[PDB]
Design an enzyme around this catalytic site. Structure first.
Site, mmCIF file in Angstrom:
data_model
loop_
_atom_site.group_PDB
_atom_site.id
_atom_site.type_symbol
_atom_site.label_atom_id
_atom_site.label_comp_id
_atom_site.label_asym_id
_atom_site.label_seq_id
_atom_site.Cartn_x
_atom_site.Cartn_y
_atom_site.Cartn_z
ATOM 1 N N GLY A 83 0.822 -1.211 0.000
ATOM 2 C CA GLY A 83 0.000 0.000 0.000
ATOM 3 C C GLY A 83 0.851 1.252 0.000
ATOM 4 O O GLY A 83 2.080 1.177 -0.066
ATOM 5 N N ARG A 84 0.201 2.410 0.057
ATOM 6 C CA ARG A 84 0.931 3.663 0.210
ATOM 7 C C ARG A 84 0.075 4.758 0.825
ATOM 8 O O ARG A 84 -1.121 4.851 0.554
ATOM 9 C CB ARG A 84 1.500 4.118 -1.130
ATOM 10 C CG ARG A 84 0.526 4.735 -2.072
ATOM 11 C CD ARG A 84 1.117 4.715 -3.455
ATOM 12 N NE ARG A 84 0.399 5.590 -4.363
ATOM 13 C CZ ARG A 84 0.494 5.552 -5.689
ATOM 14 N NH1 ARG A 84 1.286 4.681 -6.308
ATOM 15 N NH2 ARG A 84 -0.217 6.401 -6.404
ATOM 16 N N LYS A 87 0.370 9.017 2.637
ATOM 17 C CA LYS A 87 0.755 10.373 2.246
ATOM 18 C C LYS A 87 2.234 10.452 1.912
ATOM 19 O O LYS A 87 2.628 11.122 0.961
ATOM 20 C CB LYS A 87 0.488 11.366 3.386
ATOM 21 C CG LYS A 87 -0.966 11.665 3.688
ATOM 22 C CD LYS A 87 -1.073 12.528 4.953
ATOM 23 C CE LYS A 87 -2.465 13.120 5.135
ATOM 24 N NZ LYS A 87 -2.522 14.035 6.309
ATOM 25 N N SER A 143 4.789 7.752 1.881
ATOM 26 C CA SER A 143 5.600 6.628 1.434
ATOM 27 C C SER A 143 4.807 5.539 0.736
ATOM 28 O O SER A 143 3.580 5.493 0.812
ATOM 29 C CB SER A 143 6.329 6.004 2.618
ATOM 30 O OG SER A 143 5.414 5.283 3.426
ATOM 31 N N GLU A 144 5.544 4.668 0.057
ATOM 32 C CA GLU A 144 5.004 3.474 -0.568
ATOM 33 C C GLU A 144 5.604 2.275 0.158
ATOM 34 O O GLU A 144 6.805 2.247 0.407
ATOM 35 C CB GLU A 144 5.376 3.458 -2.051
ATOM 36 C CG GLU A 144 4.474 2.593 -2.910
ATOM 37 C CD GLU A 144 4.386 3.090 -4.342
ATOM 38 O OE1 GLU A 144 5.418 3.522 -4.894
ATOM 39 O OE2 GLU A 144 3.282 3.039 -4.917
ATOM 40 N N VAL A 145 4.778 1.283 0.482
ATOM 41 C CA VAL A 145 5.189 0.190 1.364
ATOM 42 C C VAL A 145 5.204 -1.131 0.602
ATOM 43 O O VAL A 145 4.269 -1.433 -0.150
ATOM 44 C CB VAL A 145 4.261 0.118 2.590
ATOM 45 C CG1 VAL A 145 4.685 -0.993 3.559
ATOM 46 C CG2 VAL A 145 4.264 1.456 3.308
ATOM 47 N N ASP A 181 0.668 8.938 16.842
ATOM 48 C CA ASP A 181 -0.249 8.317 15.879
ATOM 49 C C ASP A 181 -0.636 6.908 16.317
ATOM 50 O O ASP A 181 -0.674 5.957 15.524
ATOM 51 C CB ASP A 181 0.371 8.337 14.481
ATOM 52 C CG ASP A 181 -0.647 8.160 13.381
ATOM 53 O OD1 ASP A 181 -1.847 8.446 13.568
ATOM 54 O OD2 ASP A 181 -0.220 7.727 12.317
HETATM 55 N N1 LIG Z 1 6.763 -4.081 10.092
HETATM 56 C C1 LIG Z 1 5.817 -4.539 9.244
HETATM 57 N N2 LIG Z 1 5.666 -5.868 9.013
HETATM 58 C C2 LIG Z 1 4.726 -6.347 8.165
HETATM 59 N N3 LIG Z 1 3.869 -5.550 7.487
HETATM 60 C C3 LIG Z 1 3.908 -4.198 7.627
HETATM 61 C C4 LIG Z 1 4.907 -3.606 8.533
HETATM 62 N N4 LIG Z 1 4.726 -2.275 8.479
HETATM 63 C C5 LIG Z 1 3.703 -2.028 7.619
HETATM 64 N N5 LIG Z 1 3.217 -3.179 7.110
HETATM 65 C C6 LIG Z 1 2.091 -3.316 6.145
HETATM 66 O O1 LIG Z 1 2.222 -2.407 5.047
HETATM 67 C C7 LIG Z 1 0.944 -1.860 4.701
HETATM 68 C C8 LIG Z 1 1.051 -0.389 4.316
HETATM 69 O O2 LIG Z 1 1.879 0.321 5.246
HETATM 70 P P1 LIG Z 1 1.584 1.844 5.705
HETATM 71 O O3 LIG Z 1 2.912 2.552 5.866
HETATM 72 O O4 LIG Z 1 0.643 1.806 6.887
HETATM 73 O O5 LIG Z 1 0.838 2.470 4.415
HETATM 74 P P2 LIG Z 1 -0.748 2.774 4.354
HETATM 75 O O6 LIG Z 1 -1.477 1.736 5.178
HETATM 76 O O7 LIG Z 1 -1.090 2.852 2.885
HETATM 77 N N6 LIG Z 1 -1.028 4.339 5.095
HETATM 78 P P3 LIG Z 1 -2.597 5.122 5.022
HETATM 79 O O8 LIG Z 1 -3.137 4.815 3.644
HETATM 80 O O9 LIG Z 1 -2.284 6.587 5.228
HETATM 81 O O10 LIG Z 1 -3.401 4.502 6.143
HETATM 82 C C9 LIG Z 1 0.025 -2.056 5.902
HETATM 83 O O11 LIG Z 1 -1.247 -2.577 5.497
HETATM 84 C C10 LIG Z 1 0.758 -3.007 6.832
HETATM 85 O O12 LIG Z 1 -0.010 -4.195 7.076
#
Ligand SMILES: Nc1ncnc2c1ncn2[C@@H]1O[C@H](COP(=O)(O)OP(=O)(O)NP(=O)(O)O)[C@@H](O)[C@H]1O
Length: 328
Positions: A45-46, A48, A50-52, A155
């Protein structure tokens, strides 16, 4: 005249007795790893900033999580890195394994230990009374640790708590909104996610502290024990305060603002109304009764206070009778 100042009642001057280097994150020199150690597998996902990605560290064959930071609000990047390094190894704190420069983005990419999470929406539906207590206590370990290290998370919410329910393992993640606590410092009130914002943020009181995290935890606790997601369901940041006022009452709200010589945004004049404080039993029903106890209610009541100074500290929380049943 202006608002009356406030300071934390615990860990007040932890950063002032540190080397400048501990908290002066702007001077921090990042030690860069090798990006080629990590192979991206899929995007999770991503947000504001970063991209994860799920990735693999091809040097140990381990799963990791890579967060590739967007080129914006760069003060936050060294702040997050420094906090993650300062807190590394602490109880239930996510481990930063590496920092590398992504070749495509040309920006920092943070490499974290993998944690085997389940969707909180799915997971919380299944939690027993015992498990809520257990995992609450695990979150408190993380919070007392970061607070003791002079850091507020800012947060705290279900999405930022990774739970491996199989191994009874929990990590507090996403330290990108975290800050160093310095007594007297005025902070940005545009932090936390709506439903978890403390009254201090909602009334634009800037001189807040670690106790912000304790309000957020109380919102989590209320949602879990009452099975109401979220507990305080505001349409926007203004209605958020109104939703809180409908439970905690308006007179204690006005007492809070009067204590700190805060002036409410005049737009509240027509929407806030007059509300009595409710008794917590108001929220108990046949479907959540098994998660509620006198101890739970007393503990909740001591977290969800308008006055940030009145709230239980993380250490005080851990002393609470609610946790007597949890095996140490
Ligand atoms: N340490 C970790 N281990 C395993 N999974 C992780 C970890 N950190 C994050 N994730 C997964 O990565 C996904 C996206 O990470 P995140 O930085 O929360 O982006 P996001 O959910 O798109 N932010 P938002 O859209 O603003 O709520 C999440 O659904 C988590 O389940």
């Amino acid at each position: 005249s202006g608002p009356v100042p406030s300071r934390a009642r615990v860990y007040t001057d932890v950063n002032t007795h540190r080397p400048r280097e501990y908290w002066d994150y702007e001077s921090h020199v990042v030690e860069w790893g090798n990006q080629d150690d990590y192979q991206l597998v899929r995007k999770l996902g991503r947000g504001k900033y970063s991209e994860v990605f799920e990735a693999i560290n091809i040097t140990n064959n381990e799963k990791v999580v890579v967060k590739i930071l967007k080129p914006v609000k760069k003060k936050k990047i060294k702040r997050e890195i420094k906090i993650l390094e300062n807190l590394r190894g602490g109880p239930n704190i996510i481990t930063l394994a590496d920092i590398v420069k992504d070749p495509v983005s040309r920006t920092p990419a943070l490499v974290f230990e993998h944690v085997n999470n389940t969707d909180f929406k799915q997971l919380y539906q299944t939690l027993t009374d015992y498990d809520i207590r257990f995992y609450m206590y695990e979150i408190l370990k993380a919070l007392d640790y970061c607070h003791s290290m002079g850091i507020m998370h800012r947060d705290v919410k279900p999405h930022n708590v990774m739970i491996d329910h199989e191994h009874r393992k929990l990590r507090l993640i996403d330290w990108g909104l975290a800050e160093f606590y310095h007594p007297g410092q005025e902070y940005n009130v545009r932090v936390a996610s709506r439903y978890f914002k403390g009254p201090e943020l909602l009334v634009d009181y800037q001189m807040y502290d670690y106790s912000l995290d304790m309000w957020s935890l109380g919102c989590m606790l209320a949602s879990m024990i009452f099975r109401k997601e979220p507990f305080f369901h505001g349409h926007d940041n203004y209605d958020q305060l109104v939703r809180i006022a409908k439970v905690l009452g308006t007179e204690d709200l006005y007492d809070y603002i009067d204590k700190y010589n805060i002036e409410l945004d005049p737009r509240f004049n027509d929407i806030l109304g007059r509300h009595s404080r409710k008794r917590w039993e108001r929220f108990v029903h046949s479907e959540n009764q098994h998660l509620v106890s006198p101890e739970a209610l007393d503990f909740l009541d001591k977290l969800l206070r308008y006055d940030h100074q009145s709230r239980l500290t993380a250490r005080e929380a851990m002393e609470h009778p609610y946790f007597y049943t949890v095996v140490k």
